């Protein structure tokens, strides 16, 4: 009746999925052993979505993965939910990853991605039908970022009628292992602003100024990192794993919410930023725990408030409180901004109080929406991309697989294309 | 008196069942088949209980089309109070919807399931002869919607000669919305199906909300009290048909009563005298107040001015049951002395109509017992501000040509929105041109 | 003067493949939406050569 | 020759006519010109998906 | 009434038939003394299949166990159903084995099997009834596939319009240590693809696979592997075995198996995974029985239900249950998968039930079922066919007594023109939506 | 073709104005859009003479 | 005209081999990079000279 796939990717994609479904099977509790752990009988199909079936209500994910580092994947298979996969992600080889974008693009991935198709498409036949694709896909490596793009092309000619999820890690000067990652930047986004049907503006620097100025935590690792991420996403596609009685569906997320498509980068935040480490343990009520959805500062991205343009919001709960003081603050927070008073966004009044019982809280408050502060996260993006290219600087690592300058130009014409027209809507 | 209901979209199913249901309970159509009144199984046809047909052995079936692309709507639907009697082979549902749009399912993915229905809706039409129009239940954009209707009233307006039909189109409320191209295929809604139309007349879930909200007290705005309001609104519309009475006229009496024009065709349904488990206790009924507020703003499913409201006709329905005599009172107690502001160079005679046994009130809901009924079909010339309101925010949005792509590569193009706006700026500025009064 | 160019749109059609028994039914879906999405700019192309030479 | 000589004499024989009157009819003449351009291509289409 | 009697062919063939028999036959009971041993007389015609009376009340086989090199028969024959034959078998000379296809096939002809349709020509005229004879034919080497493919030829000409019981074994090349097995096999099956009526293709290459690494099996020898491949030869065998409801031929069986009767290879599998090896002694009830129906573990082949298009498939449950839920089972299973549906004969399956019991389990089952993910099966014997026969590669000893290069190519061709074949009907999906008036009928 | 093939390429030098503005949005980014159209047909006829070269 | 452009078609359409299938991976992965820049060598800048040739 409805079914989503599970394709992965990337070395940190990888393990922020291992997280994400860690902490989405928190509040479902699907065992790996066949004792049927049911969550919620009622709930066949909004497990059906997610964790498809193999034998007799034993449902378990479309779980296939690929990465050339094997280590990773064989230390996250002894999770708590490790193991419920079928043995069909097994799909790899040990080339090594080296950090290049070349080899994940072009020369060791085009070997490689053909089993990885041939898996999916005989995947995705066996279910009732298909509705969506998923993944989450990262650029602090470098073979992530050039075989996503080539499965997100594939998946374009192969399969056009189907939504794909594509969750991208941004660059980060803050947390970096190697620093070519503008160049890991300029030429994944090139390309995926017209292949693909949604993104994500999910930071890494904003997201570690936020782990560490505006909540003081003394745990820079990935782990926190990863759980406060999973956390987020968990928050946002509850909505669309959850339907009660609206979050519309996947061309109908896509309907209300892209105009322009390619302006199709939204930004998810969330509003109370509870972490491992220090922790507030009141009960979230809806006023003053939901006036951090409406600041600019405390979000997975560069913001601010009054040089800021919003033109879509969502707000997805899961406590079981009332809808009135949902709607005043509401008003609040979009009568009060004079720049919001555009020619553009008639209505946005999409907001859902569904009860869905949660793993650690009892309620959430998630934002998801666009703006113009993607133009700035991509303003520098572009003056690291000047730092690095305007003289031609370490261009030798990469173009002696298959690449050369023409490709970096026709992605610098779409960035001015880009800047050119969020600085027209910014103007409007 | 026999005629077959359409149902598209998931809220058109959703009216539509809770509408039966309130029909086969206030007839005594029992989920046991037969009535109990007499010894016809099934159901019957007499008079006025004449929604069945004979298909079995006197196995009559309360005939109707369930239709939606999104193939759960049915099984919710047939796991409800009414449950195993729905028709087990009519039934026609897609595999994947077109999911809150209008083009896909209209113009691509619809055009192998239309042909179904419509082999469906020859197989109902070989049945028997009576025909009195149609009831199609739609919405603008809560399941398919838009995208049948578009097509299958110009199907039905070649394919079926030029016969009368009647569509039920539920105007939209953004505070309870679940869109936001909702313009787009209101405009796009307005243009197609109502030029190739007979009758019709839009519900607003704004003005449920305000009429719950503000006007009855109560804090929940769910589509359950939607649907029982509406299986109310619906049931009192059809008793004329459903029972017999003093002036037991048809549908068609009143099609050919209301409508004076291809473009003057939308009605002002005056149905406030709102009622609950609160607003039904320990109170009196007279026929003043529920006759006294009806032109009253807050009391209409699209908001008007009354003295800028100018009433072309002014028809009324009853659902009586104790007299026509406090009617024929009622007629020179409220209707004899209304010198209110009317249309210039028309008749200005006040319509009554009255429909005895009565329809009974619903079970397990929240209103009490009632009786009085003040459906008081007027209509309205400046209700062209109840669509150029819509019209200026699709101005305000459709110069920056937001979710253009989404309807470009299904077969339109930029000059059938062009074509839109300028069917709803022509059916505005010709209200103002002779529809407001003139000279 | 149009002649060769009614042949370059039958020649377009002749781009058309059988719907291709052998094919697997997730790919003729495919050979499909291409066809489609051609002919969608073979019409745009069709009334700008109708449109274009009338003047 | 001649399927071209027609189509171009149809496409010459659809004129714009004289905007007047409070438009009423002005409606009634685009949905004209629409439709009739439809099927002169549909024509055309046609003649030369024989040949 | 019936009958269907014991002969072989194959090194590794003579062992699995002598115990094959022996587990028909283990819950039977046909002693060798000179009397009889009736203890359900209900299977006089189910035992009058495989083992015919010659004497006062005595059924006895017509087991012809034919070896070039004896050793085997001389060693495993003295079983206590071993020696209750008609003694006028066994014929056998010492000319050699060698491992040999050529020779075998070529210059043992009027050593041994000339001898061999002299004694079935009058071991099937002294008797009631002929419906075909069985075989244990095995590719362990290369004389017992020659005579297998000998013995099959002579038989499409003895009786040629009778169905006649024809097997296959698939070797081991994890086992089978031999530098060169895939001439004698690939060749073999080139020729029974047109010489045959059907092929239940055991192995014990996956058996092998399965029971080292998923059984945990520390001793891995011919006997409990044999034991394994006889369980489920006995899953296999009864539908003869057992009189049911309907007591169905397998002469009706052969037909019924096939679409087309070119193409003839199937093997079974065994669902609850019987205990040989690792034991245990619970009795398999319905849902446990079920719940291993579909799986990509114990099936006798490369697993791949991805890789499925299953055209028959029937089990027989001679446990005492009820089959509604085990045909609401099946239908579960029928549907909830999209690589089964293939709408050809659309009530292709099977439900037979009997009430005698294979062993002291009492309610239990196995998996037969039509096979499709052989291809890969196939490819892997082929290809490393072809993979030592481009350099012309091990010529020591099968250049023949008459040998061409017409024979090995139309091999080759033949072996292209049913795997092409069969991944043409494993695709081109022409009854599902695959055609071109699911959409309307007018696309151009 | 041919000959032929250079009469398309004499339909795309014959009925491609400049494109003359109308309207903001319009003939200079969409027209010329429809004209990369145009152009992006003509690289398959391209890639579809690679194939008929071959025969 | 014609001359360039139909002997370009003439050489570089005739210019294309199959790949090669039989071989390791290494020397395949070299014969598929040379394929991959080679027909978009041959499409890309050839159809963009003959599209601005002279209009």
Known sequence: MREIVHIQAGQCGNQIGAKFWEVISDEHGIDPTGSYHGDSDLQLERINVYYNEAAGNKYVPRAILVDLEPGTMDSVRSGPFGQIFRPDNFVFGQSGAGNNWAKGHYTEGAELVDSVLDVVRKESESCDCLQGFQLTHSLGGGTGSGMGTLLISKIREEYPDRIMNTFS???????????????????????????????????????????????????????????????????????????????????????????????????????????????????????????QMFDAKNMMAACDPRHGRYLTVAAVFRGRMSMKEVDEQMLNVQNKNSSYFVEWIPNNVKTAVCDIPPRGLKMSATFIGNSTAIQELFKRISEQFTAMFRRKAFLHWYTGEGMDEMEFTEAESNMNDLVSEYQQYQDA | ?????????????????????????????????????????????????????????????????????????????????????????????????????????????????????????????????????????????????????????????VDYGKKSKLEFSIYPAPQVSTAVVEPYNSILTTHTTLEHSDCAFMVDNEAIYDICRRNLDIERPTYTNLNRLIGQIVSSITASLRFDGALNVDLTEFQTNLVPYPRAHFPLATYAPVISAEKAYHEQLSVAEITNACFEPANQMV???????????????????????????????????????????????????????????????????????????????????AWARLDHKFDLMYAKRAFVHWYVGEGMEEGEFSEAREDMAALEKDYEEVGVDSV | DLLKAVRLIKFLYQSNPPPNPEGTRQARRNRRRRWRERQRQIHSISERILSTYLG
């Open chain 1, 169 to 291: 890690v941004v660059p980060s000067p803050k947390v970096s292992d190697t620093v070519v990652e503008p160049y890991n930047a300029t030429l994944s986004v090139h390309q995926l602003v017209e292949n693909t049907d949604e993104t994500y503006c999910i930071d890494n620097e904003a997201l570690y100024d936020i782990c560490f100025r505006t909540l003081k935590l003394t745990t820079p690792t990935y782990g926190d990192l990863n759980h406060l991420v999973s956390a987020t996403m968990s928050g946002v596609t509850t909505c669309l794993r959850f339907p009660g009685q609206l979050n519309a569906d996947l061309r109908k997320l896509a309907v209300n919410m892209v105009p322009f498509p390619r302006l199709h980068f939204f930004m998810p935040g969330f509003a109370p930023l509870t972490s491992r480490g220090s922790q507030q343990y009141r009960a979230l009520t809806v006023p003053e725990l939901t006036q």
């Open chain 2, 1 to 157: 008196r026999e005629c077959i209901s359409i149902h598209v979209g998931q809220a058109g199913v959703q009216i539509g069942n809770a509408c039966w249901e309130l029909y086969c309970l206030e007839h005594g159509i029992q989920p046991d088949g037969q009535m109990p009144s007499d010894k016809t199984i099934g159901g019957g046809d007499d008079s006025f209980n004449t929604f069945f047909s004979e298909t079995g052995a006197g196995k009559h079936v309360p005939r109707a089309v369930f239709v939606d692309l999104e193939p759960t709507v049915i099984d919710e639907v047939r796991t409800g109070t009414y449950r195993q009697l729905f028709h087990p082979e009519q039934l026609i549902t897609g595999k994947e919807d077109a999911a809150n749009n209008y083009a896909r399912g209209h113009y691509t993915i619809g055009k192998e399931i239309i042909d179904l229905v419509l082999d469906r809706i020859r197989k109902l039409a070989d049945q028997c002869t009576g025909l009195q129009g149609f009831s199609v239940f739609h919405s603008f954009g809560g399941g398919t919607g838009s995208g049948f209707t578009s097509l299958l009233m110009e199907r039905l307006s």
């Open chain 2, 303 to 385: 908001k008007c001015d009354p003295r800028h409201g100018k009433y072309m006709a002014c028809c009324l329905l009853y659902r009586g049951d104790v007299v026509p005599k406090d009617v024929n009172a009622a007629i020179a107690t409220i209707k004899t002395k209304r010198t209110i502001q009317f249309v210039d160079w028309c008749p200005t005679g006040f319509k009554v109509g009255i429909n005895y046994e009565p329809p009974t009130v619903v079970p397990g809901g929240d209103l009490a017992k009632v009786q009085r009924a003040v459906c008081m079909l007027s209509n309205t010339t400046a209700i062209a501000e």
